[model samples]
Target chain A: GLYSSLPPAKREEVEKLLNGSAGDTWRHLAGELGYQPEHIDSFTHEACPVRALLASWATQDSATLDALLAALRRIQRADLVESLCSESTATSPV
Target chain B: GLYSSLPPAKREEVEKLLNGSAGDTWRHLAGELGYQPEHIDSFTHEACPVRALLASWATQDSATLDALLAALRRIQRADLVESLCSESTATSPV
Candidate 1:
């Protein structure tokens, strides 16, 4: 969901935040994450040129695990924010 | 070293696998990876347009972790192929 295309049952984990709650979820999240409301909708469709109902998150210019949790909270899904910290954020080769 | 491009040491990790040993190292690995020898050189340059001395490997049509370790082995860099197998291969998302 973070940077992968959906390969699941007509939906993806990222869609949970955008579609699971309010119909205007993306409109709100775009502004909250430092972009125009339309930016979110555009990224969802443009970045995801081929995949339907899927948002390609590989374009991480406005990406971060922190912002990820923020948008999740905006949709009242903080339950998904718990990632166990990957060893308290030591480091990764990525 | 596989898909991600290099970000340090005046060269990238992928370049290490390419420029570390024989001057014609890339020429050899290209054939080993099921493409023409010239394909390797082209990807290293064309695939990496902006990043000087690097190759953007996100285009993984010819990508596989197995192929990654294989290229390393071709150069006798099997020492780098040991990744703990990520749990003997289980279900993974993307």
Candidate 2:
């Protein structure tokens, strides 16, 4: 099945959100991920949606932002979004 | 270093090109790759550059287009563009 497609205007909104102050946290996080200081800039230019979403969340309080970042870190490490789904096996009784 | 970034208008041009007749070939190729019919649409919406380039080449005839597709197939299989770069290693005698 096809995934959701963002229009150009929406993409621009996403880009702006990613380049703002909130976006700075992802840069710091990317540094910790062993990427060079400029790597995050390259990533942003690539307009990765997950990275943009994390940047949007970073504007929140520390606790919330930390939670958001944690989830994003998981997504990045997994390398595939399908693995993150909550589907259960038929063998499960619940 | 930051890779080139496409502006919104250029991105739309890309979108149009992908949605055109050449795109059908990638759809067929994706089906052969085990993706469902809808998956190619989703991939196009995601705007993968390699796929877009393939679609662009499909407008050409047998010889030229075949070579272009061959190069792109290599790129897709590699999973990383840097691997396809011709940069020589320091150990190379030439």
Candidate 3:
């Protein structure tokens, strides 16, 4: 299992994709990513709630892009998962 | 003197104005508003750093339009201060 977190550039790219289009599912994504209801609720007041959620998640030591992708998978966000994978491939050194 | 915070819509408008254009002076503004060096430094990793700073500041109990204006004045960001005042007047019920 890859223990690496996404680099800052990659995280910002995915965050941009996730921000507005992710909609109410961002709450579910937050839940899957280990945020409590109150923590998730706090982001609701932000202009970009998904960006706020991702920013908080990125601050945590346990955060990793793999974990984020898996969370999307669990939440049935295959669309985002696919998008994220493609983005990763496009940017990957490999 | 009004102690009211900027409403969410107005705050969002001002945040958009301040985000990219504040440049390095946002550090000065954050310091004038009582953010320590470490606190201000943390926003550097964010994609929209000024937005991060403003969001954190806006959460505090003492946050208000008047205090934010005073901080801008102290930081010598009169351009932003003037812009915010005009924006406020434009949106004011009066």
Best lDDT among the predictions, by candidate number: 3
lDDT per residue for candidate 3 within A1-94, as digits (tens), equals: 2323446666665666754344445757777777777775467545456666766766666666667668878999888877766776445532
Candidate 2 per-residue lDDT over residues A1-94, each given as its tens digit: 1112323443344344434413223444455545564444344343343444344434445424244346456546322123223221233222
Residue A23 error for model 1, in Å? 55
Evaluated on chain B only, candidate 1 has a TM-score of: 0.42
Which of 2 and 3 is the better model by DockQ? Answer: 3
Ranked candidates, highest DockQ first: 3, 2, 1
Docking class of 2: incorrect
**Share of native interface contacts present in candidate 1:** 0.00
Q: In model 2, how large is the Cα lDDT of residue B47?
A: 30
Clashing pairs in 3: none
Q: Compared with the true structure, what per-residue lDDT tens digits does model 1 show for residues B1-94?
A: 4444322442343344333322233434555666653444344332122233224344664555666677768777464454324232444333
**What part of the reference interface contacts, as a 0 to 1 fraction, does candidate 2 reproduce?**
0.00
Task: State the lDDT of candidate 1 residue by residue for A1-94, as single tens digits.
Answer: 3433323432333444333322233434455656654444344332121232224344554445565666768867454455223223433333
Q: First chain TM-score in every candidate?
A: 0.40, 0.27, 0.70
Q: Which stretches of candidate 3 lie above 4 Å from their native place?
A: A1-94, B1-4, B91-94
CAPRI class of candidate 3: incorrect
**Count of clashing residue pairs in every prediction:** 1, 0, 0
